[PDB]
Design a binder for this molecule. Structure first.
Ligand SMILES: *[C@@H]1O[C@H](CO)[C@@H](O[C@@H]2O[C@H](CO)[C@@H](O[C@@H]3O[C@H](CO[C@H]4O[C@H](CO)[C@@H](O)[C@H](O)[C@@H]4O)[C@@H](O)[C@H](O[C@H]4O[C@H](CO)[C@@H](O)[C@H](O)[C@@H]4O)[C@@H]3O[C@@H]3OC[C@@H](O)[C@H](O)[C@H]3O)[C@H](O)[C@H]2NC(C)=O)[C@H](O[C@@H]2O[C@@H](C)[C@@H](O)[C@@H](O)[C@@H]2O)[C@H]1NC(C)=O
Ligand SMILES: *[C@@H]1O[C@H](CO)[C@@H](O[C@@H]2O[C@H](CO)[C@@H](O[C@@H]3O[C@H](CO[C@H]4O[C@H](CO)[C@@H](O)[C@H](O)[C@@H]4O)[C@@H](O)[C@H](O[C@H]4O[C@H](CO)[C@@H](O)[C@H](O)[C@@H]4O)[C@@H]3O[C@@H]3OC[C@@H](O)[C@H](O)[C@H]3O)[C@H](O)[C@H]2NC(C)=O)[C@H](O[C@@H]2O[C@@H](C)[C@@H](O)[C@@H](O)[C@@H]2O)[C@H]1NC(C)=O
Ligand SMILES: *[C@@H]1O[C@H](CO)[C@@H](O[C@@H]2O[C@H](CO)[C@@H](O[C@@H]3O[C@H](CO)[C@@H](O)[C@H](O)[C@@H]3O[C@@H]3OC[C@@H](O)[C@H](O)[C@H]3O)[C@H](O)[C@H]2NC(C)=O)[C@H](O[C@@H]2O[C@@H](C)[C@@H](O)[C@@H](O)[C@@H]2O)[C@H]1NC(C)=O
Ligand SMILES: *[C@@H]1O[C@H](CO)[C@@H](O[C@@H]2O[C@H](CO)[C@@H](O[C@@H]3O[C@H](CO)[C@@H](O)[C@H](O)[C@@H]3O[C@@H]3OC[C@@H](O)[C@H](O)[C@H]3O)[C@H](O)[C@H]2NC(C)=O)[C@H](O[C@@H]2O[C@@H](C)[C@@H](O)[C@@H](O)[C@@H]2O)[C@H]1NC(C)=O
Ligand SMILES: *[C@@H]1O[C@H](CO)[C@@H](O[C@@H]2O[C@H](CO)[C@@H](O)[C@H](O)[C@H]2NC(C)=O)[C@H](O)[C@H]1NC(C)=O
Ligand SMILES: *[C@@H]1O[C@H](CO)[C@@H](O[C@@H]2O[C@H](CO)[C@@H](O)[C@H](O)[C@H]2NC(C)=O)[C@H](O)[C@H]1NC(C)=O
Ligand SMILES: *[C@@H]1O[C@H](CO)[C@@H](O[C@@H]2O[C@H](CO)[C@@H](O)[C@H](O)[C@H]2NC(C)=O)[C@H](O)[C@H]1NC(C)=O
Ligand SMILES: *[C@@H]1O[C@H](CO)[C@@H](O[C@@H]2O[C@H](CO)[C@@H](O)[C@H](O)[C@H]2NC(C)=O)[C@H](O)[C@H]1NC(C)=O
Ligand code: NAG
Ligand code: NAG
Ligand code: NAG
Ligand code: NAG
Ligand code: NAG
Ligand code: NAG
Ligand code: NAG
Ligand code: NAG
Ligand code: NAG
Ligand code: NAG
Ligand code: ZN
Lengths: 499, 499
């Protein structure tokens, strides 16, 4: 009988009690990163995260930082492999920057052979060290040219451009890469990129944010989500029909959260909680498992929800070999009005829920996850049991998928100095408390989870936050980015992996 | 009888001896700038100077600096007007960033109303202070989307996109702007952007520079120059046929240089010198005045030189109301082989000339213009009489045009500290020695020069040099860019203008 802690203090940092041996022999342990966040712009074309951060610098982060040079994994990819080697990691999730290998967006315009070599050297070097690549095709960094030609995922033209790009990756790397992710966190771009405009490309309704250059927060998140699902499904079909000889697997990435009722004896809060599961998870998992959106979405969103043709439904349904599930935290849900007529309406209001980290009787859901200066009431708190509830829900509701936890991690303030940043005990607590529950749900519920990749390999540019927070298990000095030094969390993880 | 100095020490800094009164009453005096160099990326789309500097940071400058924030004239445009107001300037040349008003390149994709407002506020504020705007439509900062769609000026598609962009500028600003420049320094993009790849977009033959992503140094400079002339001519035709009610004038900008024989008694060096005038100036001025390239270009460049149809010739010939002539320095010319078969052949070798600042008998042509660390022999030297020889040549050879000197200035090292940077006596010497000759050629040769705009209003990102050199008549502290403080040169110029 496995017992896991939900509340500080945690004791799962002791590798006597919890380590990789607790898991099956073949279970993959590693870390993750993404191209925009680590590589730098050297050697690649420009993408909408360059566009967005440069046009709207106050949305790139409070320090206006961006991915221009960041930790320069373009130059220092070997140092990233050295961190993985030191961890004795068996997996590394990284993304290919579309702009690095097809700077002009559309493949017929030519490929950047040097960009293709960069990823060949990286993939080799990982394989030389026994590290299994999990490669994300699209971690949000859409070539700027496509956003300017037809507004990227707002237009069905993205489907063939994304397909041709994916085809080049499979052809160039698929002999060595056996685990592909199509689109990172399906929920994020539609909502943050086209709904609240916190993220690239930064489209939204005029009264949601006057700085958006265009958009409609009420309709575009549904259009973009729909094209994501079709583009993803066309790539998975290309992969399974044309690259089956490579003997690899492909899946989408979901951002997952669990949801609990803000008041667990109030039927309206219970209803809001189940609506959140459908609107947050089901928006994508319903198409991915059934070829259709959830009924509550169909009913609420009405004419703003696109339909799949029969052919499209069939393409999308079952379009994965596994699911890359990212998990960070859980929210309480209470009812909220859905003012579909307000000029500031967003797709996110359609769920009819308000999300918090404190429930009706004042209980905070768990330990601090992220502090906010501009609003202490806007702090995020985490919930280790959330990973157990998510995995169990995916096995039960979504047909017992093969899962890899493709991100899980926590930030520490960028204010902290080097010695404080290195002593990141809060990160050990976050990681181990989640790993405890993950082992617990695999053993108790028999969820088919086969790996875990902590976010992040090293400190990097964090979307929306610049360099004001750090997520790395290894520390990077922004005055001299060459080194990646294992923090206490990375040293703990090294011992967890090889106890 | 006007006498001007060619050699240090100069004495033209004394406004008793030389001042604006020496010139006609209406003569315009001011300074110049360009959008990429001063504004910052905030509020605009991305262009190929963002692309190039981020993809090839070691080509953006030795410090890898770029125009991301630079002197932030986006925020501080009023401070630029305050410098002009302090100078009692009557002219200001600035450029409109195409990416700021049509971020998606093609006008039918929508306009950035906030970007249009930015330029409205600036133009107003100039006019409120009695400053005549001279506005450059295209100072090299091509929206990145157009370079990625069809490689920008490499393709005839640029002609209609540039026309639609120009049309929006005329419609929005032409009620207040009466002096338009179409394309900055016609010679530069073809040669540096597509020949040596020192400049955006950074295309060239593989053995010229292996870092170029594509190109052909031997053919593309001619293709790009040809499309520049057609795009320029289509815009001038649009201006003169559709905006004649605005009562303004439009012209191209030429980079001008004078050329002297490396050995003035050697017929081969004399020949090389006349070839340089045709290949450097005539490449554009021949089409602009006659609708055809120079014969020596026709003969040498052969099948690599595009032809104008009769309609095209007629559009291009006479396509200016005035010429914006930029002038910085003069070179000696000696014969050089033109190895048309070498894989490293460039369009620039077609002139069959080698250019230096020292002639055969060891005479340096004039005072130091720019120091080079990596090669003392690669120093540039200036030649005040060059401005007299250029203007006289344009009146004589090119049909007595109306001219505005749209740039003329000199850099001082970025290494210098604040007090040394402010004491920029070398800049007074450069400016006054050229102004002396300019007055001299207007009086002696009757050249129709009606204004002079020194480069630059303030320190800015210098193309190729980042922040390693300073060109401003007003100083900008890169740790706090708000202020623009008149250097000794700006204070001298203020006295020169209002003696
Ligand atoms: C997994 O995918 C399954 C499909 O492969 C889902 O089942 C479908 O669910 C549909 C509802 O979402 C359902 O469609 C409805 O069918 C009604 C009856 O259709 C016939 O009869 C009509 C009159 O006799 C006639 O007009 C038709 O020609 C049919 O012969 C129909 O009235 C419904 O339309 C109304 O409501 C919808 C909103 O749902 C409106 O869009 C529409 O304007 C109208 O107001 C509806 O029809 C659908 O309308 C939209 C159109 O684009 C669709 O093509 C059309 O089908 C459909 O019959 C079933 N299909 C089958 C094979 O079962 C399944 O849904 C879950 O299970 C069903 C039984 C139900 O409980 C759903 O609510 C559940 O979500 C998906 N499963 C999951 C878990 O999501
Ligand atoms: C200002 O613009 C003027 C044009 O509006 C320039 O004058 C033109 O200069 C052309 C030379 O550059 C000249 O064209 C040549 O004409 C030759 C004779 O043409 C007729 O006779 C042929 C046989 O009888 C016949 O095939 C034709 O059908 C004509 O009836 C012709 O042989 C030349 O072609 C050879 O050389 C050219 C290289 O220049 C090659 O391209 C070609 O393969 C061939 O080897 C040449 O013809 C041109 O060929 C290319 C084609 O695209 C052109 O359409 C074709 O014209 C032309 O006659 C004149 N036009 C007139 C009206 O004078 C003027 O040039 C300067 O002045 C001329 C007199 C000469 O001195 C030039 O060298 C000067 O540059 C321009 N001025 C300036 C200052 O640049
Ligand atoms: C979690 O949700 C539950 C269920 O909603 C909350 O309990 C309910 O709380 C209501 C007050 O917020 C109770 O209603 C009141 O009943 C009294 C006595 O008859 C009356 O004076 C009030 O006006 C009010 O009556 C309602 O008025 C509006 C009508 O539309 C409605 O039909 C009336 O009932 C309600 O009875 C109670 N329900 C139950 C099943 O307990 C619960 O609230 C917390 O507990 C209750 C017992 C009370 O102490 C609340 O103040 C307290 O906050 C909520 N929990 C938390 C922590 O918020
Ligand atoms: C500026 O250009 C002029 C004209 O080209 C230079 O003067 C010429 O310089 C040549 C040497 O560089 C002289 O030719 C030599 O003549 C002697 C005596 O007959 C002979 O011993 C040499 O081999 C050479 O002869 C040539 O060899 C190659 C043949 O194809 C050619 O036909 C032969 O003549 C040449 O006479 C002279 N021309 C004139 C008109 O003066 C000039 O060079 C400078 O001045 C000359 C006088 C001499 O002192 C050079 O060393 C000196 O550099 C050059 N000026 C500069 C500063 O470079
Ligand atoms: C976002 O787009 C939707 C749909 O195009 C707009 O909502 C429509 O508004 C018009 C005029 O009020 C109505 O006739 C339609 O019934 C509405 N359609 C639906 C599907 O709601 C909405 O106004 C747009 N929002 C903004 C802020 O531009
Ligand atoms: C808010 O969350 C707390 C903690 O999860 C809930 O409190 C638990 O409530 C159940 C019975 O209702 C008890 O068995 C536990 O002992 C309680 N735990 C603690 C730490 O007090 C509380 O019910 C939630 N409130 C609402 C309104 O849903
Ligand atoms: C640049 O383009 C030119 C023309 O397309 C190339 O030169 C041609 O080379 C081929 C093969 O050697 C010859 O058949 C042609 O006669 C040449 N044309 C001319 C106009 O010179 C040249 O090789 C290209 N350069 C590079 C470096 O790509
Ligand atoms: C190099 O430049 C110098 C300076 O312009 C030239 O020297 C002048 O030559 C003429 C006669 O040839 C004299 O009248 C001047 O007195 C000379 N000036 C000086 C400062 O010496 C020289 O001729 C040029 N050399 C070549 C080979 O062209
Ligand atoms: C790893 O943890 C298990 C419990 O899951 C424990 O029995 C085992 O001894 C630990 N291994 C080491 C090497 O500490
Ligand atoms: C597989 O490759 C062939 C050859 O290019 C292509 O034409 C075919 O349509 C592809 N199948 C897909 C994309 O499912
Ligand atoms: C940067 O880091 C590397 C690796 O630690 C070090 O050897 C190098 O000298 C450092 N340079 C500076 C300028 O700190
Ligand atoms: C790496 O992990 C393997 C597999 O558990 C183990 O046998 C090996 O000793 C580990 N190496 C290090 C240096 O920890
Ligand atoms: C300006 O210079 C002229 C010579 O060009 C001189 O005669 C005049 O007095 C000067 N004006 C002033 C105000 O110094
Ligand atoms: C002038 O404007 C009209 C109206 O748009 C346009 O159709 C016409 O062709 C323009 N003339 C030019 C571009 O010379
Ligand atoms: C920046 O410059 C402005 C204008 O000189 C000044 O008033 C402001 O306080 C300065 N800020 C800093 C941080 O130097
Ligand atoms: C500005 O120039 C005008 C025109 O020469 C002159 O009359 C006026 O006094 C000048 N103002 C200043 C403050 O120098
Ligand atoms: C729309 O939403 C914002 C944020 O939810 C809220 O503060 C504002 O009152 C709303 N406006 C209207 C007219 O509903
Ligand atoms: C081509 O040009 C470069 C620079 O001009 C020169 O150093 C090299 O020798 C040349 N190569 C050949 C084969 O001509
Ligand atoms: Zn940047």
């Amino acid at each position: 009988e496995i017992t896991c802690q939900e509340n500080n203090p945690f004791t799962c940092g002791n590798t006597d009690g919890l380590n990789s041996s607790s898991f099956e022999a073949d279970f993959i342990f590693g870390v993750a990163s993404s191209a925009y966040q680590i590589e730098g712009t050297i050697g690649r074309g420009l993408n909408i995260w360059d566009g967005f951060t440069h046009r709207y610098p106050d949305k790139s982060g409070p320090d206006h930082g961006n991915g221009d040079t960041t930790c320069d994994s373009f130059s220092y990819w070997q140092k990233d492999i050295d961190v993985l080697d030191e961890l004795n990691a068996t997996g590394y999730r990284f993304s290919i920057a579309w702009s690095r290998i097809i700077p002009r967006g559309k493949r017929s315009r030519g490929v950047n052979q040097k960009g293709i070599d960069y990823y060949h050297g990286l993939i080799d070097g990982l394989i030389k060290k026994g590290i299994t690549p999990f490669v994300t095709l699209f971690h949000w960094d859409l070539p700027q040219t496509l956003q300017d030609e037809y507004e990227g995922f707002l237009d069905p033209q993205i489907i063939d451009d994304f397909k041709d790009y994916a085809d080049l990756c499979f052809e160039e790397f698929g002999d060595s890469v056996k685990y592909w992710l199509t689109i990172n966190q399906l929920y994020s771009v539609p909502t943050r990129g086209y709904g609240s405009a916190l993220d690239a490309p930064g489209r939204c309704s005029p009264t949601v944010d006057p700085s958006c250059y265009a958009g409609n927060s009420s309709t575009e998140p549904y259009i973009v989500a729909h094209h994501q699902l079709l583009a993803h499904a066309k790539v998975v079909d290309l992969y399974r029909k044309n690259y089956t000889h490579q003997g690899g697997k492909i899946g989408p990435t979901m951002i997952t959260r669990w949801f609990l009722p803000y008041n667990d004896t109030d039927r309206h809060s219970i209803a809001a909680t189940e609506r959140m599961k459908q609107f947050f998870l089901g928006w994508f998992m319903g198409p991915l498992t059934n070829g259709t959106y959830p009924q509550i979405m169909i009913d609420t969103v009405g004419a703003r929800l696109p339909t799949f043709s029969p052919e499209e439904t069939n393409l999308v349904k079952g379009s994965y070999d596994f699911l890359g599930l990212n998990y960070y935290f859980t929210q309480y849900a209470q009812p909220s009005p859905n003012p579909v007529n307000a000029t500031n309406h967003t797709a996110m209001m359609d769920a009819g829920a308000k999300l918090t980290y404190i429930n009706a009787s004042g209980h905070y859901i768990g330990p601090l996850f992220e502090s906010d200066g501009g609003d202490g009431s806007s702090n995020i708190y985490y919930y280790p049991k959330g990973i157990y509830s998510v995995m169990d829900y995916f096995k039960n509701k979504y047909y017992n998928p093969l899962i890899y936890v493709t991100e899980n991690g926590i930030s520490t303030p960028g204010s902290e100095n080097r010695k404080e940043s290195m002593l990141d005990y809060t990160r050990i607590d976050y990681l181990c408390s989640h790993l405890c529950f993950l082992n617990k749900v695999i053993k108790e519920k028999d969820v088919n989870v086969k790996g875990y990749l902590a976010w992040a390999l090293g400190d990097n540019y964090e979307f929306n936050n610049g360099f004001t927070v750090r997520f790395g298990l290894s520390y990077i000095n922004w005055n001299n980015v060459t080194d990646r030094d294992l923090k206490k969390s990375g040293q703990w993880y090294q011992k967890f992996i090889s106890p």
